[PDB]
Amino acid sequence: VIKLHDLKPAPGEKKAKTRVGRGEGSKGKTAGRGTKGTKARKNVPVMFE
Amino acid sequence: TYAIVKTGGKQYKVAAGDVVKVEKLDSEPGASVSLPVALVVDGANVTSKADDLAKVAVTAEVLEHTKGPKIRIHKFKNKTGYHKRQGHRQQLTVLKVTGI
Amino acid sequence: EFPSATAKARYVRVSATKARRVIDLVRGKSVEEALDILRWAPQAASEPVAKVIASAAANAQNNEGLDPSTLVVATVYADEGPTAKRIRPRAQGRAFRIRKRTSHITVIVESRPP
Amino acid sequence: TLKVDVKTPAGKTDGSVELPAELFDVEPNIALMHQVVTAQLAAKRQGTHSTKTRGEVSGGGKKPYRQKGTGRARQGSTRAPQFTGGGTVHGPKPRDYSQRTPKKMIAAALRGALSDRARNDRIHAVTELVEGQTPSTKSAKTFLGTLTENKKVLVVIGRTDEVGAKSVRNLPGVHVISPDQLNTYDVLNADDVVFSVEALNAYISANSK
Amino acid sequence: ARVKRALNAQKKRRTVLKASKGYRGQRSRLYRKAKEQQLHSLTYAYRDRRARKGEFRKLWISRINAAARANDITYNRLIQGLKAAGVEVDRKNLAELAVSDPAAFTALVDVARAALPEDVNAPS
RNA sequence: GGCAGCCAACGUGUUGGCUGGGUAGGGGAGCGUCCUGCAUCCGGUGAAGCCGCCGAGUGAUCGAGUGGUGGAGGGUGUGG
RNA sequence: AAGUCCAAGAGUGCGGCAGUGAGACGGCGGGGGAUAAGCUCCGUGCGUCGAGAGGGAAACAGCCCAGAUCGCCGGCUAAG
RNA sequence: GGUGAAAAGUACCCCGGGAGGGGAGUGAAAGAGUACCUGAAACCGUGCGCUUACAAUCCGUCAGAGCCCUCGACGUGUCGUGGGGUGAUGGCGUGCCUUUUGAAGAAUGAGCCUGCGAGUCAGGGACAUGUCGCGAGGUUAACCCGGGUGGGGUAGCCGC
Ligand SMILES: [Mg+2]
Ligand SMILES: [Mg+2]
Ligand SMILES: [Mg+2]
Ligand SMILES: [Mg+2]
Ligand SMILES: [Mg+2]
Ligand SMILES: [Mg+2]
Ligand SMILES: [Mg+2]
Ligand SMILES: [Mg+2]
Ligand SMILES: [Mg+2]
Ligand SMILES: [Mg+2]
Ligand SMILES: [Mg+2]
Ligand SMILES: [Mg+2]
Ligand SMILES: [Mg+2]
Ligand SMILES: [Mg+2]
Ligand SMILES: [Mg+2]
Ligand SMILES: [Mg+2]
Ligand SMILES: [Mg+2]
Ligand SMILES: [Mg+2]
Ligand SMILES: [Mg+2]
Ligand SMILES: [Mg+2]
Ligand SMILES: [Mg+2]
Ligand SMILES: [Mg+2]
Ligand SMILES: [Mg+2]
Ligand SMILES: [Mg+2]
Ligand SMILES: [Mg+2]
Ligand SMILES: [Mg+2]
Ligand SMILES: [Mg+2]
Ligand SMILES: [Mg+2]
Ligand SMILES: [Mg+2]
Ligand SMILES: [Mg+2]
Ligand SMILES: [Mg+2]
Ligand SMILES: [Mg+2]
Ligand SMILES: [Mg+2]
Ligand SMILES: [Mg+2]
Ligand SMILES: [Mg+2]
Ligand SMILES: [Mg+2]
Ligand SMILES: [Mg+2]
Ligand SMILES: [Mg+2]
Ligand SMILES: [Mg+2]
Ligand SMILES: [Mg+2]
Ligand SMILES: [Mg+2]
Ligand SMILES: [Mg+2]
Ligand SMILES: [Mg+2]
Ligand SMILES: [Mg+2]
Ligand SMILES: [Mg+2]
Ligand SMILES: [Mg+2]
Ligand SMILES: [Mg+2]
Ligand SMILES: [Mg+2]
Ligand SMILES: [Mg+2]
Ligand SMILES: [Mg+2]
Ligand SMILES: [Mg+2]
Ligand SMILES: [Mg+2]
Ligand SMILES: [Mg+2]
Ligand SMILES: [Mg+2]
Ligand SMILES: [Mg+2]
Ligand SMILES: [Mg+2]
Ligand SMILES: [Mg+2]
Ligand SMILES: [Mg+2]
Ligand SMILES: [Mg+2]
Ligand SMILES: [Mg+2]
Ligand SMILES: [Mg+2]
Ligand SMILES: [Mg+2]
Ligand SMILES: [Mg+2]
Ligand SMILES: [Mg+2]
Ligand SMILES: [Mg+2]
């Protein structure tokens, strides 16, 4: 008799979110952006060369 | 008399009754191990020749298995942001030597 | 151990470090010697501390019922109390802070043998 | 293909109801009905949580002081996030949490849960909960106790039958739902599911074509 | 769902401060300065744990050299002769022999000299 | 003597061989915090918090081990 | 044609996510300079630093030796 | 913002000009006293233990004498698979972060503690990859009926 606590997502379904800028153990002080530039703070439009 | 046992890649000076903390040995506690010798001193004469040093072994009994001191490692390099923590406890056996 | 009597004076309008400077004169002395030393010592913080010592002696007079002359000021100290903050106006529109500090003087006296 | 006996409040039985295997003998799907119940409770989440961002808090229009020469940090308003009383940065705003799973996912989860109850003899049909004209929690409780010993029961009754739902509404472990409202969450809560003849027939007939 | 980050924040603080006991100054009082000191402390512990095995070998060699020269032989010739003789006792226990009972050390020096070339400077 | 990554063999958990410095950066697996569905357990014979003792883990950390203080709520499993 | 081949963790193609686009000194080949610069500009299946800990050079990123998985109060060596 | 269940908010006595306290009482508690639940850290004392006044100290780490405490054993003070505290002395040892070819740097930032402070959300958005349902099909949008998370809704959209 399956009850509500017996329910479980299929293996491989749920991936953990990557929380960034939460220490130097994973992704810190730049959050995967590298050093300065345009790309260090905003973006570049896809139609720009 | 007293001998110098070889065990765990290390040499320990030993006399009958001495207790020594050596590296891990595969022997359940209570069992008796036999260990080779690097030197024997009986009174005023020593056994240094290789063949007749191989003729004598030191018989000891295992009292327990022990964990070494807790060692904490925190590798760190400045201005790079690089840290690395880990720990180590070494596994050991306590030997009460009985005969030489 | 020895029989002891206590006295506390809290929120006395004297800096703790200025109370200690006369407390250090009388620590571990007979009550009468301490009261004399405080009475002729020329620092104003003697007025609180002296009273506190005398108060403790009276407790041993009236609550332990023990001999006046055996009293010794075993422990005495001055803790900090609440601080009030004020402002002194200074040159060119600056405003500096002023601390009105207080103290808690604690004394325990014991009736040691002669 | 189960054949559930219908039981009357007198302690007797009247007949039996056939449970179609395409409807009560489905292999359960743990991942599927996990998704279905999680979506259900997402729809139940009243997302009425809110904060104020940097521009919504009161005041803050002025630049607090001159930008150079004062020997202090450059500050653009007193409602900036780092200030006490300032705006929250990535804070909650109201959200609609419902997600719309496909119809046949929901239906399959229903059938799988009801099949799970049927395989273990947790489905009961009864003529009615209590003899009519008046609610009675005492007698309905006694009958339901004869019918099951477990703590939680679904009581699937037709909407018109009010005397029955009234007499079973105040039992602590009993949950009352209508056959057209049947969902996988309520049936997975229940240790037993107690139908009425009318409600069992109604659920069967709503899925017979 | 707001969290007050103080339950979790204090744990590493207590760890580092308890590890920093005995530090003179404010390196045993303030979590930040104590953490800065703990970085150096654990790197220094690694460094010295590695170099302790060299410091102790240095000490054993010095003791062995002194005892050997008391026995009128050089350290290097002594261990060359012990290698030639097949007696294979390490410098640790060779230092315990030098200290505790010098008679066995004298006998072992005798063996090392007996097992040594008639000319140590010979072209061989 | 302990660990781990890749691979292989019998085979189905072992063994073996190679390998394991590292910033920007990519990938993987986890610790601790809070709120919650469902399930269990503890608590005025004293919950949380705090301060210790004695310990534990490869790391974040742990202590349904213990005392002091304290005075009403907490733990654990499996999902969100 | 072989070698390496329980590895180089090698090529090539498609895709997801990048950072980088300020380099430094030393060896060898050169331009500019006065065949000056700890100068400047190029070449190099050249090296090291960057991003490299450990030993030597008194101290001394870039020179010589040697690439740190952890532990040991074992042994043999490299530059010196 | 928070005494306590209830003011039962300390009668009376003593020191003091009062403030403050000490007895006595109230209370389950006053380590609840109208400066009041819990009462952390920074910061400030007092008491004890070890150390320190010929010595050039990123303030640690490794080795280490002496002293002090504690747990066992034999016994009656000396070892032991011990554990703590402090440390004369000896070797090694140039803070953290940013940003740089390169900083212990005499480049930046930071007096200290406690609380707070930065990749979030919306959308039948786009691309890719997991997972699930159905499958040459898949799915509904507005909307309608349900005190619900359920059921109808073929317009369209994507594949062909
Ligand atoms: Mg999300
Ligand atoms: Mg940082
Ligand atoms: Mg990126
Ligand atoms: Mg930056
Ligand atoms: Mg740049
Ligand atoms: Mg960039
Ligand atoms: Mg645009
Ligand atoms: Mg550097
Ligand atoms: Mg750097
Ligand atoms: Mg980083
Ligand atoms: Mg006076
Ligand atoms: Mg003015
Ligand atoms: Mg000022
Ligand atoms: Mg505004
Ligand atoms: Mg300034
Ligand atoms: Mg502006
Ligand atoms: Mg606000
Ligand atoms: Mg629908
Ligand atoms: Mg110390
Ligand atoms: Mg392996
Ligand atoms: Mg690595
Ligand atoms: Mg390596
Ligand atoms: Mg990185
Ligand atoms: Mg917790
Ligand atoms: Mg839960
Ligand atoms: Mg209970
Ligand atoms: Mg009670
Ligand atoms: Mg809580
Ligand atoms: Mg208690
Ligand atoms: Mg407690
Ligand atoms: Mg979760
Ligand atoms: Mg090859
Ligand atoms: Mg490889
Ligand atoms: Mg590669
Ligand atoms: Mg450019
Ligand atoms: Mg360029
Ligand atoms: Mg270049
Ligand atoms: Mg240059
Ligand atoms: Mg050149
Ligand atoms: Mg040129
Ligand atoms: Mg140049
Ligand atoms: Mg070049
Ligand atoms: Mg760089
Ligand atoms: Mg180097
Ligand atoms: Mg390199
Ligand atoms: Mg060379
Ligand atoms: Mg050699
Ligand atoms: Mg050489
Ligand atoms: Mg009472
Ligand atoms: Mg209490
Ligand atoms: Mg207060
Ligand atoms: Mg309080
Ligand atoms: Mg001196
Ligand atoms: Mg000097
Ligand atoms: Mg030192
Ligand atoms: Mg030095
Ligand atoms: Mg700059
Ligand atoms: Mg810079
Ligand atoms: Mg520059
Ligand atoms: Mg500076
Ligand atoms: Mg300076
Ligand atoms: Mg600058
Ligand atoms: Mg400054
Ligand atoms: Mg703030
Ligand atoms: Mg979105």
XYZ file of N, CA and C (backbone and C1' of nucleotides) in Angstrom, chain B residues 71-77 82 84-88, chain E residues 38-54, chain F residues 21-22, chain G residues 53-55 67-73, chain H residues 60-62 91-92:
209
model
N 45.432 13.959 12.560
C 46.216 14.957 11.846
C 45.271 15.729 10.944
N 45.296 17.050 11.046
C 44.454 17.913 10.237
C 45.321 18.710 9.274
N 44.999 18.614 7.990
C 45.720 19.257 6.906
C 44.806 20.315 6.314
N 45.306 21.537 6.188
C 44.607 22.596 5.469
C 45.615 23.239 4.527
N 45.756 22.658 3.342
C 46.589 23.247 2.312
C 46.028 24.600 1.915
N 46.909 25.579 1.754
C 46.451 26.929 1.472
C 47.534 27.645 0.695
N 47.136 28.395 -0.326
C 48.065 29.255 -1.051
C 47.470 30.645 -1.187
N 43.042 29.304 -3.042
C 43.111 27.851 -2.991
C 43.260 27.370 -1.552
N 42.362 23.607 0.823
C 42.106 22.175 0.699
C 42.215 21.553 2.083
N 41.094 21.169 2.666
C 41.083 20.554 3.982
C 40.983 19.045 3.866
N 41.620 18.350 4.800
C 41.463 16.910 4.940
C 42.045 16.502 6.282
N 41.830 15.243 6.641
C 42.351 14.715 7.881
C 42.866 13.307 7.684
N 43.666 12.863 8.645
C 44.256 11.535 8.585
C 44.394 10.969 9.985
N 45.388 30.417 11.817
C 45.205 28.991 11.609
C 45.696 28.567 10.237
N 45.545 29.437 9.237
C 46.109 29.143 7.921
C 47.606 28.869 8.016
N 48.339 29.788 8.635
C 49.773 29.613 8.798
C 50.088 28.416 9.677
N 49.290 28.195 10.719
C 49.570 27.111 11.647
C 49.488 25.765 10.960
N 48.456 25.549 10.149
C 48.331 24.244 9.516
C 49.294 24.070 8.351
N 49.619 25.136 7.613
C 50.691 24.985 6.633
C 52.012 24.667 7.315
N 52.322 25.366 8.420
C 53.583 25.121 9.171
C 53.591 23.698 9.732
N 52.433 23.183 10.177
C 52.370 21.829 10.700
C 52.653 20.815 9.608
N 52.127 21.043 8.404
C 52.455 20.185 7.269
C 53.951 20.220 6.962
N 54.503 21.428 6.841
C 55.912 21.619 6.519
C 56.803 20.888 7.513
N 56.548 21.093 8.805
C 57.374 20.523 9.852
C 57.108 19.047 10.077
N 55.899 18.564 9.820
C 55.675 17.130 9.829
C 56.494 16.444 8.752
N 56.651 17.088 7.599
C 57.510 16.521 6.562
C 58.986 16.606 6.936
N 59.431 17.731 7.505
C 60.855 17.921 7.810
C 61.294 17.342 9.152
N 60.371 16.830 9.960
C 60.744 16.207 11.223
C 61.548 14.938 10.995
N 61.217 14.192 9.945
C 61.960 12.992 9.604
C 63.384 13.295 9.154
N 63.656 14.516 8.717
C 65.003 14.904 8.367
C 65.756 15.476 9.545
P 48.792 15.592 -8.875
O 48.773 17.014 -8.188
C 48.863 17.156 -6.783
C 49.208 18.572 -6.421
C 48.165 19.607 -6.796
O 47.164 19.738 -5.808
C 50.271 20.306 -7.578
P 45.660 20.124 -6.196
O 45.812 21.444 -7.055
C 45.912 22.710 -6.435
C 46.391 23.756 -7.401
C 45.354 24.297 -8.360
O 44.608 25.344 -7.771
C 47.290 23.691 -9.555
P 56.658 27.578 -5.298
O 56.422 27.034 -3.824
C 55.119 26.917 -3.276
C 54.942 25.591 -2.588
C 56.198 24.952 -2.033
O 56.595 25.492 -0.795
C 54.973 23.338 -3.210
P 58.144 25.563 -0.424
O 58.639 24.064 -0.545
C 58.757 23.241 0.599
C 59.458 21.954 0.267
C 60.953 22.053 0.052
O 61.679 22.037 1.266
C 59.997 20.857 -1.727
P 62.833 23.115 1.550
O 64.086 22.548 0.769
C 64.690 21.327 1.155
C 65.813 20.945 0.226
C 66.824 22.021 -0.095
O 67.767 22.257 0.929
C 66.195 20.971 -2.081
P 60.593 14.083 -10.582
O 59.499 14.882 -9.767
C 58.131 14.861 -10.133
C 57.370 15.869 -9.321
C 55.858 15.784 -9.416
O 55.313 16.117 -8.152
C 56.558 17.931 -10.052
P 54.781 14.971 -7.177
O 54.939 15.623 -5.740
C 54.745 14.865 -4.562
C 53.965 15.640 -3.538
C 52.506 15.882 -3.864
O 51.688 14.777 -3.555
C 53.485 17.893 -3.167
P 51.273 13.753 -4.702
O 49.788 13.341 -4.336
C 48.815 14.326 -4.059
C 47.854 13.849 -3.007
C 48.461 13.557 -1.649
O 48.664 14.710 -0.859
C 47.124 11.749 -2.287
P 49.964 14.831 0.063
O 49.543 14.137 1.424
C 48.355 14.514 2.095
C 47.999 13.532 3.176
C 49.134 13.076 4.073
O 49.480 14.011 5.076
C 47.913 11.206 3.388
P 50.975 14.047 5.642
O 51.077 12.748 6.554
C 50.203 12.522 7.649
C 50.452 11.172 8.281
C 51.887 10.872 8.676
O 52.240 11.434 9.921
C 50.973 9.017 7.542
P 53.741 11.898 10.198
O 54.544 10.539 10.291
C 54.330 9.651 11.370
C 55.216 8.444 11.265
C 56.684 8.723 11.042
O 57.355 9.087 12.235
C 55.968 6.974 9.620
P 57.560 10.629 12.627
O 59.017 10.680 13.245
C 60.155 10.424 12.435
C 61.081 9.422 13.073
C 60.471 8.062 13.387
O 61.475 7.063 13.265
C 61.243 9.046 15.372
P 51.516 32.948 18.715
O 52.037 31.590 18.076
C 51.140 30.581 17.644
C 51.399 30.224 16.208
C 51.966 28.842 15.942
O 50.965 27.842 15.888
C 53.208 30.449 14.755
P 50.996 26.602 16.900
O 51.668 25.433 16.063
C 51.394 25.243 14.686
C 52.623 24.766 13.965
C 53.414 23.686 14.677
O 52.892 22.398 14.432
C 54.878 25.378 13.902
P 52.906 21.281 15.572
O 54.389 20.721 15.530
C 54.834 19.927 14.445
C 56.322 19.717 14.488
C 56.905 19.240 15.803
O 56.742 17.853 16.020
C 58.207 21.009 14.966
P 68.740 27.575 16.292
O 67.921 26.593 15.344
C 68.577 25.576 14.605
C 67.620 24.835 13.711
C 66.897 25.663 12.667
O 67.672 25.875 11.503
C 65.351 24.280 13.785
P 67.437 27.176 10.596
O 65.919 27.052 10.133
C 65.546 26.142 9.114
C 64.057 26.098 8.917
C 63.392 27.380 8.464
O 63.547 27.630 7.086
C 62.127 26.420 10.194
